[PDB]
């Protein structure tokens, strides 16, 4: 009955356990780099110009 | 040219409109029930007799009125989510086995799963018509008095009759006493919490009472009543 | 052997969690401590597009970013031209509780699917202009609560089965099934790449499935209370939750937790939509509290609030290339800001 | 203020009556001459008149002191060093309670009525500004309230040139030059825009008062159709029966600018159609009544304070004041009431009013925090 | 990550008194509404004992009342059900549940099959 569940969530935990983590410092460097890199494209971060904003 | 284009456009968008309000004096129209119940509580016989004599959908006609009831069916037993769904939803027809055994407490879980729909804010609006299935398989039952609901419920004892009692004709005092104790259980619920938004309609059905159609149909016309009532703060 | 086995699960959940720890060297609050808030965003409705007449429960963007399909309660699936405010197509559906839809990538189909356990496709670029099911994609036994047109005839369609699934249109059978969540399954998100899909499930947890293998490449823990919204970060590693509890999550995909918590003390309302900016410096989420909040995604700040609902706001989006938000809610309304 | 009318009467007959007399008696010093608008009378040689000033103006009891001194010449009257042909004469000498009673009654009636109009088109503007009030039902009330504002200017318009023709005629003790504005067919067709406002007033009253009926009791209508068909009968049915009456007015009487209503059962044309509005607002009121009581009967402490409060706020609403009306006090409340009900309906539906209220609390919040 | 650990179930003869502590952890405790769920033998999950975030508001189910009793200890996260003279029937796997939203009065699903904030139980034997 519920040995399959138990079996199957037991090598769920293992496939998660072995993977490649990385350092939450290095994830957030990423983070905000990709958040400081991409602010220009971001016609809402930026406020665009009404003449080039087809929504007005 | 994009004036000829934007114009058939416009003439697109104006059939499409001239659909869409032909369509909203259907929508508007038919009524929306949600139709609940525990595990074989009775309500597919109700169903069947509110399809014939005039998830699953049913949709039917009393007095020139349409009313759309959706028995939610092959869904899982978590209704956290779906009754979200439920909203515009005139009523959340409740239906509970009042006899359920003769299988653990389903009258309890019953009470809990109503109290749980009456906080639910979401639900804070949306009345509930409550269809205590099963009055006659529970009036042998305790008139039997072999299972009683007093090992369930204490107070049923220290609980006297109301008299605003109308038994049938055949119904013992042993029986309009489960009958008017388990009505004030949930009325318990229904009035400790939400005065005025959304009101429960109990009711006492069996598979054989046919004029269910009507009490729910009576009771929906309340349902819109009181709430034109509370849009002009007339209520 | 279950109390064995259960044991054996506890000691590799603890490992993970202290493997977690281990990777929790800081944390954003400290290294964004020295970024630059994006200052205070005050944006207004600049279309209102009416017309449905039921609550709006979901709404997707056409890859042209012009057009939009919205589904709502009252059985229709409707497709808007925002330049032109104008309805291209009003699409019946044959079930009324329609709790999805979804625009395919190449424009030539689109999807709805809710309560009838049935993912309904609609072909637009039709001969006859007469947008015609196609299919209709049968086999969960729960709900149909949010359907991702992936690009080759494919579809990702998350259910209230607790069961997500790969289906194969031309076919009309799933390929894949995703496997693994315990609770009503009730968003989807195709990562940029569109080869993994992120789920959100009434688990409080988010599972990273690969498309192509079928394996939940990871499980995301930390939210409290049904995840009601998901949707991915603009470089597809990572991705951001919004739920009942109140609260937006960020999960990273290599940091393997959350990176940050959107969350106020004086919202008590459940989140319902979420979607990103062009940069994902901005976060756009839908709220009970009838407003879209638009959170910065470095600071867990309000940066904004997007407020003229009359009702739950239930889905949003934003145009491809970023130059508006479309927000359905349910007082029927879909209103366009920037 | 209350009538430049009856003295206007009064001139006409007084002048037929003593020009006869003059003609009876001619005298054989003073020579006759007739002033075209003033009949004198028939007195004696050898001996002067003593008289008090004339009796056509109310006024003349008001200081019955003033007194009438006419000397007269061999070429009987003055002409004056001016270009000018006027007799030389000096008579506002007895010009300055039922007046002071009145006078703060009308005065009352035009704060309220004045105020009705202000907050009313202030809640007008409100309705119409939020968008998300916008449903039926307050299409139904923004009509209600656009009549009633109707009706409000066009009082102050049927009490402004009243007080204009009065004060020009008293002013110059002129009498004339007005009566050709009295005799034309304009104060008549602004006066039957008057009967019209009213009309449309109580009708849209009546309106609202048949769409909350339905709205209770058949919910089976198309609101697209069913809204077009309100519109029209509150706009025009006050049209189907106000422009016959118009027209009986024309045909069949005479001037005054049609605000004797002497043949009343030509009155009658416009009387029963608002008071058959007033009576099904009346049954709706009841019925309306009798379903709340009902509701109330079928809940669990007290529905008498509750349902006090409901019906107080359900009578302006339907306009039930004029069950009663439909003698200083008996005027004074049927003046009052209807004044005072354009204030308390948009006190009660657009103030008070829990959604628009949540609606304003919404967007004061919204822009309070924008800045 | 929502965890419910639960003990002091075990075996006790019948007419007894005993104790389950709810160990909560992983969500705080005073946000949400809590109560006590069983399974006796027979495959029924039924709802016992109701008691807000403050604790001010405390229901029981018919069968247990003036016998049973619930604490809560917002503060250690823990939820206490003191189980004074039992019955044979008492014999259940109580499981210690929190409804899904906080700050709610509303309780959905706590009782549901495969409800997912619920606890893994204790056995309580009479
Ligand atoms: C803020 C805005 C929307 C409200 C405007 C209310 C205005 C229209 C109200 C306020 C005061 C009122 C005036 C004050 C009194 C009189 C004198 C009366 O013999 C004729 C009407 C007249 C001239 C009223 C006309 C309407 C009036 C001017
Ligand atoms: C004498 C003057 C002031 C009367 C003018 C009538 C105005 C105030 C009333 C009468 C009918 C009303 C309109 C009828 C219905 C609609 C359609 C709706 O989609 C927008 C509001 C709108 C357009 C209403 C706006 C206000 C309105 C135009
Ligand atoms: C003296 C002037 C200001 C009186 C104006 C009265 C106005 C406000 C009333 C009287 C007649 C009414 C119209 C009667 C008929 C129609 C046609 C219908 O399909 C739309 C509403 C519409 C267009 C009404 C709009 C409001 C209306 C124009
Ligand atoms: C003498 C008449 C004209 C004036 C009396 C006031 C009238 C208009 C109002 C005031 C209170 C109202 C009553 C209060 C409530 C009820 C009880 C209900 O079961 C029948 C209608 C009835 C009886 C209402 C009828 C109309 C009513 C009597
Ligand atoms: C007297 C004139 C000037 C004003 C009329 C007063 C009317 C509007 C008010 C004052 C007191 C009110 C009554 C007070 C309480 C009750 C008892 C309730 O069971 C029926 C309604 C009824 C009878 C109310 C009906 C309306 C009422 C009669
Ligand atoms: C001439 C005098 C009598 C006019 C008085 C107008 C008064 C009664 C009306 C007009 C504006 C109204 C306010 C409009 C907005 C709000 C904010 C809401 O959150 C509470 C009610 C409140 C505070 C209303 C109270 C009543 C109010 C102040
Ligand atoms: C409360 N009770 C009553 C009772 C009666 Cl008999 C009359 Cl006439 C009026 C009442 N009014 C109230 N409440 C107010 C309206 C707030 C004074």
Redesign the pocket.
């Known amino acids: 009955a519920s040995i399959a569940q138990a079996r199957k969530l037991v090598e769920q935990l293992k496939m998660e356990a072995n993977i490649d983590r990385i350092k939450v410092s290095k994830a957030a460097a990423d983070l905000m780099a990709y958040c400081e890199a991409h602010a220009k494209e971001d016609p809402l971060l930026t406020p665009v110009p009404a003449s080039e904003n087809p929504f007005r | 040219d994009q004036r000829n284009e934007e114009k058939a456009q416009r003439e697109a968008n104006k059939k499409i409109e001239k659909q869409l309000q032909k369509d909203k004096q259907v929508y508007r129209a038919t009524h929306r029930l949600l139709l609940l119940g525990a595990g074989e509580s009775g309500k597919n016989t109700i169903v069947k007799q509110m399809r014939i004599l005039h998830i699953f959908e049913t949709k039917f006609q009393v007095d020139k009125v349409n009313f759309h009831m959706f028995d939610v069916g092959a869904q899982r037993d978590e209704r956290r989510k779906w009754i979200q769904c439920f909203n515009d939803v005139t009523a959340i027809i409740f239906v509970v086995a009042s006899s359920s055994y003769n299988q653990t407490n389903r009258l309890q879980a019953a009470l809990k799963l109503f109290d749980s729909i009456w906080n639910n804010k979401w639900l804070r609006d949306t009345s509930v018509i409550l269809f205590l299935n099963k009055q006659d398989l529970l009036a042998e039952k305790v008139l039997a008095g072999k299972s009683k609901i007093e090992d369930y419920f204490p107070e049923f004892a220290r609980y006297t009759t109301p008299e605003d009692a109308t038994p049938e004709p055949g119904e013992d005092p042993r029986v309009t006493r489960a009958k008017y104790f388990i009505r004030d259980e949930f009325l318990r619920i229904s009035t400790a919490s939400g005065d005025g938004r959304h009101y429960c309609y109990p009711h006492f059905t069996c598979a054989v009472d046919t004029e269910n159609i009507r009490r729910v149909f009576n009771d929906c016309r309340d349902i819109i009543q009181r709430m034109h009532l509370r849009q002009y703060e007339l209520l | 052997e279950l109390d064995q086995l259960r044991q054996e699960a506890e000691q590799l959940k603890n490992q993970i969690r202290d493997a977690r720890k281990a990777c929790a060297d800081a944390t954003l609050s400290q290294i964004t401590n020295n970024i630059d808030p994006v200052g205070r965003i005050q944006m207004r409705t600049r279309r209102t597009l009416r017309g449905h007449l039921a609550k709006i429960y979901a709404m997707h963007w056409g890859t042209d970013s012009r057009l939009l399909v919205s589904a709502s309660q009252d059985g229709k699936l409707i497709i808007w031209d925002s330049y032109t405010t104008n309805k291209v197509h009003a699409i019946p559906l044959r079930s009324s509780w329609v709790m999805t839809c979804a625009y395919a990538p190449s424009g030539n189909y689109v999807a709805c699917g809710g309560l009838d356990n049935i993912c309904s496709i609609y072909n637009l670029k039709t001969r006859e202009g007469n947008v015609r099911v196609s299919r209709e994609l049968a086999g969960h036994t729960g709900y149909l609560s949010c359907c991702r047109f992936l690009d080759d005839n494919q579809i990702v369609t998350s259910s209230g089965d607790t069961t997500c699934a790969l289906w194969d249109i031309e076919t009309g059978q799933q390929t894949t099934t995703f496997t693994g969540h315990t609770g009503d399954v009730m968003s989807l998100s195709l990562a940029p790449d569109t080869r993994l899909f992120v789920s959100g499930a009434c688990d409080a947890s988010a599972k990273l499935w690969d498309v192509r293998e079928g394996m939940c490449r990871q499980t995301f823990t930390g939210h409290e209370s049904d995840i009601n919204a998901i949707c991915f970060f603009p470089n597809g590693n990572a991705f951001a939750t919004g739920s009942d509890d109140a609260t937006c999550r960020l999960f990273d995909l290599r940091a393997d937790q959350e990176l940050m918590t959107y969350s106020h003390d004086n919202i008590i309302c459940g989140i319902t939509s979420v979607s990103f900016s062009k940069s994902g410096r901005l976060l756009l989420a839908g709220y009970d509290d009838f407003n879209c909040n638009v959170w910065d995604a470095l600071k867990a700040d309000r940066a904004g609030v997007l407020a003229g609902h009359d009702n739950r706001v239930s889905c949003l989006g934003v145009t491809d290339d970023g130059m508006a938000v479309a927000t359905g809610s349910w007082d029927s309304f879909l209103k366009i800001w920037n | 203020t209350v009538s430049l009318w009856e003295t206007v009467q009064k001139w006409r007959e007084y002048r037929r009556q003593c020009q006869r007399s003059l003609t009876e008696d001619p005298p054989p010093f003073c020579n006759r001459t007739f002033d075209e608008y003033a009949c004198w009378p028939d007195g004696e040689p050898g001996s002067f008149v003593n008289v008090s000033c004339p009796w056509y103006l109310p006024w003349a009891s008001s200081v019955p002191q003033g007194h009438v001194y006419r000397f007269c010449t061999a070429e009987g009257l003055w002409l004056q060093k001016d270009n000018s042909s006027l007799p030389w004469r000096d008579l506002s000498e007895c010009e300055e309670s039922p007046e002071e009673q009145l006078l703060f009654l009308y005065i009352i009636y035009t704060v309220g009525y004045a105020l009705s109009f202000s907050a009313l088109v202030i809640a007008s503007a409100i309705l119409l500004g939020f968008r998300h009030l916008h449903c039926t039902r307050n299409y139904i009330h923004l009509?209600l309230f656009?009549s009633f504002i109707?009706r409000a200017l066009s009082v102050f318009i049927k009490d402004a040139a009243l007080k204009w023709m009065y004060s020009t005629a008293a002013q110059q003790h002129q009498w004339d030059g007005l009566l050709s504005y009295q005799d034309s067919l304009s104060c008549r067709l602004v006066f039957l825009?008057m009967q019209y406002c009213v009309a449309?007033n109580y009708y849209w009253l009546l309106v609202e008062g048949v769409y909350l009926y339905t709205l209770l009791a058949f919910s089976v209508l198309s609101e697209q159709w069913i809204f077009?068909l309100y519109?029209?009968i509150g706009?025009?049915v006050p049209?189907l029966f106000v422009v016959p009456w118009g027209i009986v007015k024309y045909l069949y009487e005479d001037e005054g600018c049609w605000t004797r209503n002497s043949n009343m059962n030509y009155w009658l044309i416009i009387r029963l159609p608002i008071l058959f509005a007033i009576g099904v607002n009346f049954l709706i009121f009841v019925r309306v009544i009798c379903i709340v009581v009902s509701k109330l009967k079928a809940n669990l402490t007290d529905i008498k304070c509750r349902l006090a409060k409901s019906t107080l706020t359900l009578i302006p609403l339907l306009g039930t004041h004029e069950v009663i009306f439909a003698r200083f006090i008996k005027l004074f409340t049927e003046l009052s009431f209807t004044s005072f009900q354009g204030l308390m309906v948009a006190i009660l539906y657009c103030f008070v009013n829990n959604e628009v209220q949540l609606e304003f609390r919404k967007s004061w919040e919204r822009w309070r925090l924008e800045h | 990550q929502v965890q419910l650990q639960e003990s002091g179930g075990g075996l006790v003869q019948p007419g007894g008194s005993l104790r389950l502590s709810c160990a909560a952890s992983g969500f705080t405790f005073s946000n949400y509404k809590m109560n006590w769920v069983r399974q006796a033998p027979g495959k029924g999950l039924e709802w016992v004992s109701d008691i807000s975030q403050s604790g001010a508001s405390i229901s029981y189910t018919g069968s247990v009342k003036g016998r049973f009793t619930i604490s809560r200890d917002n503060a250690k996260n823990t939820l206490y059900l003191q189980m004074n003279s039992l019955k044979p029937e008492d014999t259940a796997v109580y499981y210690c549940a929190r409804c899904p939203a906080p700050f709610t009065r509303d309780c959905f699903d706590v009782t549901s099959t495969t409800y997912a904030y619920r606890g893994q139980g204790t056995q309580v034997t009479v």
């Open positions: 009509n656009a109707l825009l449309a077009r519109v029209s706009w025009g049209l």
